Design a protein around this ligand. Structure first.
Ligand SMILES: FC(F)(F)C1=NCCNC=C1
Length: 580
């Protein structure tokens, strides 16, 4: 029978189904391996090994045939199997994939593209079966990735190697390495890596390249940099020396941060940029565009009554237009970047901008996990933005859910559906546990420290609606009891799911969310007690009510003084509501 197209992330620009599917044989003829991108071919080899698919050395016409290469390779049998499809006319990083009557063909516009075709290929195949499809695919935004920019417990080395492979698998191509643990990033910002630190950095650098990730080395000399006279000169050379020493280990992307600094003059920040850009970036000729974050980096701090402040205005004139400029949106952590905000800032800097989006980062509100999708990001932003990065959580495993959606948003922006993306993330990442994780993660999408920092999808919004509806039914004495029954079932479901997650989540996830699992179980029991209160009072029964009321205060006080935080406006607020 038919072979269905599995979930893919990101969603490819164009995918047509052309056959029923077929089973890839025990082993295959691989064609083009000698001409095609070395990293694409190694990804392919690893996948084939991990799935017990051998490679014939002698062509066997009984065996499935896999042909891989770039446009700029001369592989006639690739064009033959593509049978009309082509990557020739796509942007950079695009590719074409055709799977049909026993052949798979992958043609990248460039090697990045080819590597990305392999990542699609990997997603399409299940228990050796592939659908017969026809894909041409390319990204909306051209830098797409992560900045390691949060505070708190930095990621381990093993976390980073895991993330980088993950970024490659979801077609993210940028990783800004600016950890606050690392002295060689800020304090000690002059000063090459020791010797004891070189083997670690080298592994980060090489893993990145192997997965088509731009390892951007982030530097932050605001701590103590001198701009004037001999000191200015000496420090500029320390900057150059430092970048040379990283150039020498393989680094070909650099970012310079001015976000925390004493001497706060735009003209001086932009001169150090412009000179580095000339004397280093351009001189080397294989270094990617320099990146910077300026001292004013949110619309709040950058603009006043539609007019740039002094800093921004000066920085914006002075700074070379080849330089990439990061800004976080309307504020540092904000609901939205609407098109008008992008336009405004893009206009001022007179260029396509770079986004530093502070979600899912939780460093400002550590008890809550941010497990929701990219949200409030206007689906036309690519008109003014061609570099998009997320600042994730200290919790690397669970950051994968938001990051997975950032991958769809930034690759295929027209078609981005936050809720569809959110479900696909959980489905793809959590397997046999996805339905349970969805129940739980549903209550942990929304960030709000109640001062300055608010972003993300509202928690569990269907359930909020049923809770509001229950209060209307009660307070205009209409019948409520179908709903009450329905809500007993929801709260039971919450508890069931979180218990199943505690029992079955692998440690790598469990250990980042177990406090919250417990917290949501508690609030769920208090929610259950809160309906017990409502039933008791509608049956005028003080015994059952004062008993239930005690149980509900009990769960609320546990949650209120636990470190963990979750479902503040839904599962937690329901209990507060019932007790008033
Ligand atoms: F002020 C600090 F930089 F230390 C800080 N700011 C944002 C909130 N998260 C943790 C620390």
């Amino acid at each position: 029978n038919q072979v269905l197209v599995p979930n893919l992330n990101p969603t490819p620009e164009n995918l047509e189904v052309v056959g029923d599917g077929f089973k890839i044989t025990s082993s295959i003829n691989l064609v083009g391996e000698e001409e095609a991108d070395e990293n694409a071919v190694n990804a392919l080899r690893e996948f084939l090994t991990a799935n017990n698919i051998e490679i014939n050395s002698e062509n066997d016409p009984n065996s499935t045939t896999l042909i891989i290469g770039e446009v700029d390779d001369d592989i006639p049998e690739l064009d033959e199997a593509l049978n009309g499809t082509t990557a020739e006319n796509l942007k950079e990083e695009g590719y074409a994939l055709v799977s049909n009557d026993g052949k798979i063909a992958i043609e990248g516009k460039d090697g990045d593209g080819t590597f990305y075709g392999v990542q699609t290929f990997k997603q399409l195949v299940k228990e050796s079966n592939i659908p017969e499809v026809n894909i041409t695919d390319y990204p909306t935004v051209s830098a797409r990735g992560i900045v390691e920019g949060f505070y708190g417990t930095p990621w381990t080395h093993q976390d980073r190697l895991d993330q980088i492979k993950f970024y490659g698998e979801n077609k993210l191509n940028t990783y800004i390495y600016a950890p606050k643990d690392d002295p060689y990033h800020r304090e000690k910002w002059r000063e090459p890596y020791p010797e004891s630190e070189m083997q670690r950095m080298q592994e980060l650098i090489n893993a990145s390249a192997e997965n088509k990730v731009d390892f951007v080395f982030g530097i932050s000399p605001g701590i103590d940099i001198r701009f004037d006279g001999d000191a200015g000169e000496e420090d500029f050379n320390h900057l150059i020396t430092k970048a040379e020493s990283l150039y020498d280990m393989g680094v070909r992307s650099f970012a310079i941060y001015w976000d925390d600094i004493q001497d706060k003059s735009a003209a001086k920040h932009a001169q150090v940029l412009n000179r580095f850009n000339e004397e280093f970036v351009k001189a080397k000729g294989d270094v990617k565009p320099l990146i910077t974050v300026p001292t004013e980096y949110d619309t709040g701090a950058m603009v006043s009554n539609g007019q740039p402040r002094a800093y921004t205005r000066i920085f914006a004139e002075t700074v070379d237009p080849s330089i990439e400029v990061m800004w976080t949106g309307p504020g540092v952590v904000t609901n939205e970047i609407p098109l008008s905000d992008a336009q405004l800032i893009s206009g001022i800097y007179d260029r396509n901008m770079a986004v530093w989006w502070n979600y899912p980062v939780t460093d400002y509100f550590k008890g809550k996990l941010a497990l929701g999708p990219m949200h409030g990001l206007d689906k036309g932003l690519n008109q003014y933005v061609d570099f998009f990065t997320v600042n994730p959580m200290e919790h690397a495993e669970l950051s994968k859910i938001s990051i997975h959606t950032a991958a769809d948003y930034s690759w295929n922006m027209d078609n981005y559906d936050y809720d569809k993306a959110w479900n696909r993330a959980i489905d793809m990442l959590y397997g046999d546990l996805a339905e349970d994780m969805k129940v739980f993660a549903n209550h942990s999408t929304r960030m709000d420290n109640k001062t300055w920092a608010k972003s993300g999808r509202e928690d569990a919004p269907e359930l909020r609606a049923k809770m509001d509806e229950l209060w209307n039914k009660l307070s205009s004495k209409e019948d409520a009891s179908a709903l009450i029954e329905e809500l007993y079932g929801e709260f039971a479901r919450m508890e069931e799911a979180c218990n199943n997650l505690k029992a079955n989540l692998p440690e790598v996830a469990l250990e980042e969310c177990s406090r919250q699992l417990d917290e949501l179980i508690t609030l769920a029991q208090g929610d259950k007690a809160s309906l017990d209160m409502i039933v008791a009072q509608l049956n005028e029964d003080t015994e059952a009510y004062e008993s239930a009321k005690e149980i509900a205060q009990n769960k609320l006080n546990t949650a209120l003084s636990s470190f963990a935080v979750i479902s503040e406006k839904v599962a937690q607020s329901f209990i507060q509501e019932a007790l008033s």
